[PDB]
Symmetry: C3
Subunit: 308 residues, 3 copies
């Protein structure tokens, strides 16, 4: 089971600096060559080439609808293709709206997969509840089966097929949820471990519960969508929406180490790394180094050491 690195230098999902530079920033640290050092074979697919949809006027409050939908449609076909080939797709991200395509592709092949979403945010606003109108804050809304039809058809997303049930997703790291989002997750019964549950339980018990809940009855593919703002700004400063009181570098690694151990990791997303938003170059260094370390962890690197 090899690894397939897939770059997605896209930012139309949001307004900020240059999240599209995230893939280049990550490879710069030698992420690909480092991955090849694990027991996994690795293939770099390269970065996708996105072309904007000309008259991409806002659909209500939703910005760059057609462009975001066009990019994601392309990504779903690419991820789907590497999934069918029996590989572990790794999307080096731009904004988190690319999770729509990443997960849609992964789900077309492994429909029974589950999603672990590490993020300070739920990204579950619909094109109606979100005032920002930034698609990176609505990916899960476009993917959940229960919200299907709860919002008007959005131009550019007619190819999307709600692929994940509200009970197949687990949030870890929440601390910045909008009113409408908290309503949805609450009314839909979505399982989450906010920073409050993390402080109470400890990351160790959080994983046991995350796994028993998602893998208790039957085992299935795991798709970990990782937003770097999930960890605390001290560790991942170079992101568009940083929130204090985040996951520590240690807890982040624990998460991935545990996920590795399940041997079920099937899809991975490393998103929101925006090098331009570094107050100093070192802040980018920290962000990138933290992202790379997490990525390597998902693939066997253990802090206790490794040997063949």
């Amino acid at each position: 089971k090899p690894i397939e690195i897939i770059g997605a230098p896209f930012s139309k999902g949001q307004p900020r600096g240059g999240v599209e530079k995230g893939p280049a920033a990550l490879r710069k640290a030698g992420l690909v060559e480092k991955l090849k050092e694990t027991e996994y074979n690795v293939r770099d697919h390269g970065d996708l080439a996105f072309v904007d949809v000309p008259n991409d006027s806002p659909f209500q409050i939703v910005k760059n609808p057609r462009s975001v939908g066009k990019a994601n449609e392309q990504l779903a076909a690419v991820v789907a293709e590497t999934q069918k080939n029996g590989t572990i797709s790794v999307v080096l991200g731009g904004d988190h709206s690319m999770a729509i395509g990443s997960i849609s592709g992964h789900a077309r092949v492994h429909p029974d997969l589950c999603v672990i979403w590490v993020d300070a945010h739920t990204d579950i606003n619909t094109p109606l509840t979100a005032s920002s109108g930034n698609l990176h804050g609505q990916p899960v809304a476009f993917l959940l089966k229960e919200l299907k039809g709860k919002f008007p058809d959005v131009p550019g997303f007619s190819w999307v097929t709600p692929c994940i049930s509200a009970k197949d997703i687990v949030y870890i790291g929440l601390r910045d949820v909008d009113p409408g989002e908290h309503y949805i997750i609450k009314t839909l019964g979505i399982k989450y471990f906010s920073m409050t549950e993390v402080d109470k339980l400890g990351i160790g018990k959080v994983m046991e519960e995350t796994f028993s809940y998602l893998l208790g009855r039957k085992k299935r593919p795991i798709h970990l969508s990782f937003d770097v703002d999930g960890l605390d700004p001290v560790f991942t400063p170079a992101t568009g929406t940083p929130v204090v009181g985040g996951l520590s570098y240690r807890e982040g690694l624990y998460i991935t180490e545990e996920i590795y151990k399940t041997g079920l990791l099937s899809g991975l997303d490393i998103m929101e790394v925006n090098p331009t938003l570094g107050k100093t170059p070192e802040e980018v260094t920290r962000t990138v180094n933290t992202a790379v370390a997490l990525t390597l962890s998902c693939f066997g690197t253990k802090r206790e050491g490794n040997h063949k």
Copy 2:
């Protein structure tokens, strides 16, 4: 049900005076406006006027014994008034000596109240054991029954009536306790959770035990006195007496969230916030925001999110 913001720009409890600007800084951050966005209604009693006592000769070691005792005598009067109005009192103060007026006036109405003292210090020096003479380090000493008549009656504190006992206060965050203080807390059998206990049990079990101790025989009014230096200097740098290795931002919010969950919060103190002590504007903004964040949490704001 209602909430009343009381301002206490008093700094005679310590050699630093920037702590007087605390209320204005918090108010400038939008504390008032944010509290109204909760489930509670809010009232701003405005700031108290502290008439400074002329010939305030030092009482042996104690500094400004009359000026502090008089400022607090008012606070206690103001606080006793809002408490009878059936509202939750919240004091945005300067130094922690004002805890005397806040807690005294609060208990003046609710004598069966308990106290949760979040602080890196015990602030329980008696005018005799204290070596600094700064009253912001002796408040608990002027409030505990067991310590009454155990040190020469200081001038200006005649009006104070020992309200709490040794089994009605719980310390959280201790990491710098002078010898005479450690002697008293243990001789008196005061219940506390120093950083050592927080590290071992974990903040989750820590809150579970304080609530068990203070509210075991019965549910009663809770007074939360929050010294911003209880959180590590990384989070609350703009404060008078900072000590490394304190409670984290997450643990700080955890405490306040839990106390809100009891529905017993009756009195609140947010002290020692001093903007003039911010090495860089971002340090004052960081300190202030955490103080506001801690307050909102006390009144419902949850990290998992909120909706109407």
Copy 3:
């Protein structure tokens, strides 16, 4: 039970000159004076003068054998002498290669001693498994019985006799282990607590398990060899081999507080403080003060407070 500080200004164990200045930096932090103020009586033996060996050329790959050996031989005899008289030895070191002499000398007076190694590294590379050739990454290999006869006897170390068995040592803080080292610790079944275990169990649980393991069968003296890089670079930045995701300040203090509480503390090493590797003078003070706080903790200072 008295205490005797022993300076070990040596650095031929690693490539970066400067750690030789560690003992002078610690005293300059008032370590000796702060120690006398606890309940223990203190004596400072001063620093040892090492004899730079002439034709000290590499031994296949290990750098400066004769220099490190003779250096360690000197310390051993000194540590043996102080231990003999019935005092607790505190070795202020240069690089961690001096642990060979600290522990060797300690074991002559207490053959049943156990060892608690706080490090980000296992320092158990052999002259054949290592590659850096630096001996500060091999002290444990020279002390373990199970490792004798697993590599060629090094020139200048024949005075050494493996003193600890694979079951008499416990590691805490591990996060940067070499493949060869990892193979060794799993092969020999050595007990350890990588940051992974600390994240999972909590430092409180880690200490209980460490004591059950080492002091379960029977009670015996404890040797605590503390590498400052065991703590996170945020607290001990001035060290040769910094590694993110380290033990926190609070955890370092919890470890040392629990050790002190056993009453069996007999030998201690405070190593790898390089005051020249500090990118800024404050980073040197920060690392020196952290190490100092750690030591005081090892001899009674508790965050809850102290009093005669």
